[PDB]
Design a binder for this molecule. Structure first.
Ligand code: MG
Lengths: 405, 541
């Protein structure tokens, strides 16, 4: 296309790092057709340009449909490129406390600012063909691409000039920008909320949603099943669970409870609690209410979110930065695909945990998923409805104890 | 007339400088013939001694053969755009079909002018004192690293205006062959064919004079209502050179995408050498069996039919002998589009349900490759068996919409551990221990009813003494038993719920679990205050 009139910023990759060289995964006929229609129009508008095989870099590309959406949207898997891109040069702590927060897709705006020439070769992607009838169609971005971490950083100043007449007339509203998404939160009534976000939407169209309520987000604490009549199995499960909790709270003790299990008894034999055993169980009950020592959010380190399948459509999750120091614990239930699809529920869990982590800390976690690599890589794109993609690892070790019920 | 593709060597690396072998009189004579004939065509140009680069050239039959391995080692990487090769089952029935071959494919796509310096080669000096001629390539040389990708890209950018100007015909291009399919009347189809050949001829691409039903395309025969892969013939030779071995691994790794169970590993192992492209090679017996059994599997005739997008894809799976599965993809009953075998049994513990899931996911992936859609499955497993499995499995797992087909042997769950401790059942606190020094150990259990047992063991590890303790608990208990262990290893193996294993101890534990009625396996932390675990531990201590 034509040389963009806006002067370009000189971007570069991390020192010593080369561009991404990731292979394209197979795509359905529907998504290939959608990406052909999208990328042809994008090539006509000068946003992307065809390249040859001399470009040794590639980035996966596919298409998604958002919630209650019938239109395909192109999603490029810029995860490796974002990992290899240089970090640039704040997250509002007030956003998490607002009653209503709307997410708007402002990635299209990025299509108005050109991308650095010497950097364009790193944004190469290839649209595959069914049955390899024709060789894949390769493009590179001449403009700030959606899903790249550099696009919002470079478009930040322009966005500030776009939103100043809305930011000073309404200083109560909180605005945070992450990747292709804009989060606008407030404590206002929902009717005024729709009107104000429509106001900002037209304000965006003069230059040219997805609603959440974070103050209703619940935590899931460590609860001890405290019954009246105890079988041997219940007490040994409790001793294992508190022996596991003793790494989070070093004050936990399991001595007087373990003394009840003395001798070789049947697992279903009822055991009466002693006096110091009930006292110690109550003490350990309250030590779990004390905050964990040394816990705090470090933006310089990565967030890690582990997910556990609990059956009957409920899934627990933990967000921490180092073991046993959980910034947030929670549980989900009655999601899409409940009681008939584990991959869909796990995908929706990843999306919810990611959205919450962006609202709270302004960054996506790295996920430990309870699924084989092949299954997740086989079906996860069929249910993805977000414009960002977090990195994930695969856990194949069965948990001895659930620990979050 | 084609615009060239920019080519650059790897960073900080100059062109190649390989000494040229002097050959005999006859080889040189033929090389001067073929090389002059190639200089009459614009393919190569004579260069003065200003060029310091050289590439070895030989002469086998005549036929010229250039060794570009060093130049390829110094040429930049190129992105392989294709995800594989086209499968004939993905072809839709067309009223008119024509397959064209590109004559002198590489030798008609120009090479980057700045890169030709590195394509320099010498014809060896035959002697009283006669000269060796020095050529450089003006075109993509055969065997060069970047020739396939650049030729494919140039062919695409040449065909695109014609494919847009002719939407009624479809063109699938790959290597030597162009597939032109159409539903037009055969006359208009022929006219479009000639338009395509004139279009290619304007760019300097000739195509010498397939019009007959046996359309050979990518080693396939495209009959009107079916397709059959051409039987691949492998050479039977007393002595192998190194060029024939690399060519053979080319055709074998090519044949891998159409045949299952064809391996090139030990043959590819013999490509790490400094030897030139003509020296004799000793053939390892591993490569001997590798070429033998592969040469036997290529005798299997593979056939199928074409794809009808108006119907759905059906994928049926069947259980075989040893971790083997068979699958058929068809749209009409028994008219298979593609059949195949899946061979995987985990080197660790596994079960049939996991293997079935992996098969479903793999054939789903290749089905999206060939047809871009996921087929409806027919699997030898009951609905309640699957429901119990995925609902009770600790990992997230799922398979697409399917229907049960009663094709023995059925996939079953051979045992199911219970969720709660069993009232009235015997409780076995098990433990084991061993010493690395004396390679001797003990495995035992204690029981609420006072029953206990300790067995001394040779050729056992600690993690094996734990499994041995669980095994002894299963042997000496009734049909309902609760087992308490302190080993996350053994319990971690049992929680994966396998039905077969390489370790015969694990397999006997599996049989003991199948013969039981109720088994509740619990875990307690080791070396803490704990009722029976410290007892059996003190015994095995
Ligand atoms: Mg022990």
């Amino acid at each position: 296309g034509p040389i963009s009139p806006i002067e370009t910023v000189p971007v570069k990759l991390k020192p010593g790092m080369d561009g991404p060289k990731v292979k394209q995964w197979p795509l359905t006929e529907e998504k290939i057709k959608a990406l052909v229609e999208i990328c042809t129009e994008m090539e006509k508008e000068g946003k992307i340009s065809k390249i040859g095989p001399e470009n040794p870099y590639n980035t996966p590309v596919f298409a998604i449909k958002k919630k209650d959406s019938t239109k395909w949207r192109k999603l490029v898997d810029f995860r490796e490129l974002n990992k290899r891109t240089q970090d640039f040069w704040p997250h509002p702590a007030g956003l998490k406390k607002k009653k209503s927060v709307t997410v708007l897709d402002v990635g299209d705006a990025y299509f108005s600012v050109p991308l650095d020439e010497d950097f364009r070769k790193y944004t190469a992607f290839t649209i595959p063909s069914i049955n390899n009838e024709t060789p894949g169609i390769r493009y590179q971005y001449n403009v700030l691409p959606q899903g790249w971490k550099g696009s919002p950083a470079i478009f930040q100043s322009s966005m500030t000039k776009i939103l100043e007449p809305f930011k000073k007339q309404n200083p109560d509203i909180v605005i945070y920008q992450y990747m292709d998404d804009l989060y606008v939160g407030s404590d206002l009534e929902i009717g005024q909320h729709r009107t104000k976000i429509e106001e900002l939407r037209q304000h965006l169209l003069r230059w040219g949603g997805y609603e959440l309520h974070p103050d209703k987000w619940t935590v899931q604490p460590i609860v001890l099943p405290e019954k009246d009549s105890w079988t041997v199995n219940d007490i040994q499960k409790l001793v294992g669970k508190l022996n596991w909790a003793s790494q989070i709270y070093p004050g936990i003790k399991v001595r007087q409870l373990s003394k009840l299990l003395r001798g070789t008894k049947a697992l279903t034999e009822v055991i009466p609690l002693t006096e110091e055993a009930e006292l110690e169980l109550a003490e350990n009950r309250e030590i779990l209410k004390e905050p964990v020592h040394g816990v705090y959010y470090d933006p310089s380190k990565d967030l890690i979110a582990e997910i556990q399948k609990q059956g009957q459509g409920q899934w627990t999750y933990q967000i921490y930065q180092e073991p046993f120091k959980n910034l947030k614990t929670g549980k989900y239930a009655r999601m899409r695909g409940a009681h008939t699809n584990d991959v869909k529920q796990l995908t929706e869990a990843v999306q919810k945990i990611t959205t919450e982590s962006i609202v709270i800390w302004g960054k996506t976690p790295k996920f430990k998923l309870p699924i084989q690599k092949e299954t997740w890589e086989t079906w996860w794109t069929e249910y993805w409805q977000a414009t960002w993609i977090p990195e994930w690892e695969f856990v194949n070790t069965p948990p001895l104890v659930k620990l979050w019920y | 007339p084609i615009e060239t593709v920019p080519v650059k060597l790897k960073p900080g690396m100059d062109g190649p400088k390989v000494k040229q072998w002097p050959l005999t009189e006859e080889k040189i004579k033929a090389l001067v013939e073929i090389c002059t004939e190639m200089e009459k065509e614009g393919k190569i140009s004579k260069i003065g001694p200003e060029n310091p680069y050289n590439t070895p050239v030989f002469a086998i039959k005549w036929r010229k053969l250039v060794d570009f391995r060093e130049l390829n080692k110094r040429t930049q990487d190129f992105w392989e755009v294709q995800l594989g090769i086209p499968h004939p089952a993905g072809l839709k029935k067309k009223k008119s079909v024509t397959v064209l071959d590109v004559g002198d494919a590489y030798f008609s796509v120009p090479l980057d002018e700045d890169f030709r310096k590195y394509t320099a080669f010498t014809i060896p000096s035959i002697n009283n004192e006669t000269p060796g001629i020095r050529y450089q390539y003006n075109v993509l040389p055969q065997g060069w690293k970047g020739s396939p990708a650049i030729f494919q890209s140039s062919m695409t950018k040449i065909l695109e205006p014609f494919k847009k100007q002719n939407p009624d015909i479809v063109i699938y291009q790959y290597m030597d062959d162009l597939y032109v399919g159409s539903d037009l009347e055969i006359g208009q189809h022929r006219t479009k064919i000639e338009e395509l050949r004139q279009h290619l001829l304007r760019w300097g691409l000739t195509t010498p004079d397939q019009k007959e039903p046996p359309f050979l395309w990518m080693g396939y025969e495209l009959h009107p209502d079916k397709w059959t892969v051409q039987p691949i013939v492998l050479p039977e030779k007393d002595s192998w050179t190194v060029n024939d071995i690399q060519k053979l691994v080319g055709k074998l790794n090519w044949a891998s995408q159409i045949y299952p169970g064809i391996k090139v590993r030990q043959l590819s192992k013999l490509l790490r050498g400094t030897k030139a492209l003509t020296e004799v090679i000793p053939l390892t017996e591993e490569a001997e069996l590798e070429l033998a059994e592969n040469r036997e599997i290529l005798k299997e005739p593979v056939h199928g039919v074409y794809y009808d997008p108006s119907k759905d894809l059906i994928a049926e799976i069947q259980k075989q002998g040893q971790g083997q599965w068979t699958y058929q993809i068809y749209q009409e009953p028994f008219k298979n589009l593609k059949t195949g075998k899946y061979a995987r049994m985990r080197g660790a513990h596994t079960n049939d349900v996991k293997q079935l899931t992996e098969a479903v996911q793999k054939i789903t992936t290749e089905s999206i490759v060939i047809w871009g859609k996921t087929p409806k499955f027919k699997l030898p497993i009951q609905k309640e068996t699957w429901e119990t499995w995925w609902t009770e499995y600790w990992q997230a797992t799922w398979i697409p919409e399917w229907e049960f087909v009663n094709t023995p042997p059925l996939v079953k769950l051979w045992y199911q551990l219970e969720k709660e401790p069993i009232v009235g059942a015997e409780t076995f606190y098990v433990d084991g221990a061993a010493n690395r020094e004396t390679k001797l150990g003990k495995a035992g259990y204690v029981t609420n009813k006072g029953r206990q047992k300790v067995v001394p063991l040779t050729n056992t590890t600690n993690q094996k003494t734990e499994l041995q303790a669980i095994y002894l608990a299963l042997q000496d208990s009734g049909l309902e038993v609760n087992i308490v262990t302190d080993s996350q290893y053994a319990l971690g193996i049992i929680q994966a719920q396998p039905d077969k294993s390489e370790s015969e101890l694990v397999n006997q534990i599996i049989e003991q679990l199948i013969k039981k009625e109720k088994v509740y396996l619990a875990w307690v932390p080791a070396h803490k205050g704990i009722g029976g675990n410290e007892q059996v531990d003190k015994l095995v201590s």
